[PDB]
Amino acid sequence: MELVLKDAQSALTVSETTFGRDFNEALVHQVVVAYAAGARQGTRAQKTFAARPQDHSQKVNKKMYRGALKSILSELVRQDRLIVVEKFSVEAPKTKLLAQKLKDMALEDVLIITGELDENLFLAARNLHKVDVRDATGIDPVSLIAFDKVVMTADAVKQVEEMLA
């Protein structure tokens, strides 16, 4: 499974089981719901019943979690929501530069994931509400679905595949 880049227009072949797997709606629904339930602080009580603080955390099998990532990640390729570039960085930590760098690419709501997070890139995108920046190690299933487009650097895709399959 090779995807054509934008700047260099080259290819990067990856296992179809990663970027070309079927969409498991039930599996994705389970994992996405699990993440949302895991983040809530269920602290409440009354004082006819009365509530107690509770843990909404659910278990996700290590292999089962990766399987959900493959299905959503593959769906991005089929939906053409995945843009791959060789290089993506800014000279200085200025959000204005990030805005100009994005309108040229015709991207408004984008998730930018990089192999090695740059300090300037992170700071520049901090004040852009529709732009999020992650590192290859710090990717998250919910984020990959929420954002309209996903920009990945050449290093990131290589790291992601070895981390996934």
Partner RNA sequence: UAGCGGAGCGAACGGGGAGCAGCCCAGAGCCUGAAUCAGUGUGUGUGUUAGUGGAAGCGUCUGGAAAGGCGCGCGAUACAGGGUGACAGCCCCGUACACAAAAAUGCACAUGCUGUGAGCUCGAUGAGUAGGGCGGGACAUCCUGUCUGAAUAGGGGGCCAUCCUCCAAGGCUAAAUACUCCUGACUGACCGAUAGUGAACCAGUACCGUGAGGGAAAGGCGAAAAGAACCCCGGCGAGGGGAGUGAAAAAGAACCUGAAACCGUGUACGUACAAGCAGUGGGAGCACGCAGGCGUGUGACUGCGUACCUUUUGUAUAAUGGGUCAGCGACUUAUAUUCUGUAGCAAGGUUAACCGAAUAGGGGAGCCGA
Task: Report the interface residues with RNA, using CB under 7 A.
Answer: 24, 26-27, 30, 35-49, 51-52, 54, 56, 59-67, 93-96, 99, 123-124, 126-129, 137-138, 140, 163
Q: How far apart are CA 134 and CA 127, in angstroms?
A: 14
Q: Which residues contact 104 (CB under 8 A, 6 or more apart)?
A: none
Closest separation in Å from C-beta 11 to RNA: 26
Closest separation in Å from C-beta 93 to RNA: 5
Closest separation in Å from C-beta 42 to RNA: 5
Q: Is the Cβ–Cβ distance between 19 and 3 less than 8 Å?
A: yes
Q: How far apart are CA 106 and CA 148, in angstroms?
A: 12
Cβ proximity to RNA, 6 vs 96, nearer residue:
96
Q: How far apart are CA 147 and CA 162, in angstroms?
A: 23
Main-chain dihedrals φ then ψ at residue 2, nearest 5 degrees: -110, 135
Cβ proximity to RNA, 5 vs 105, nearer residue:
105
Cβ proximity to RNA, 14 vs 132, nearer residue:
132
Cβ proximity to RNA, 50 vs 80, nearer residue:
50
Q: How far apart are CA 118 and CA 122, in angstroms?
A: 6
The single-letter DSSP state of residue 130 is T
Closest separation in Å from C-beta 9 to RNA: 30
Q: Which residues contact 61 (CB under 8 A, 6 or more apart)?
A: none
Cβ proximity to RNA, 30 vs 81, nearer residue:
30
Closest separation in Å from C-beta 29 to RNA: 9
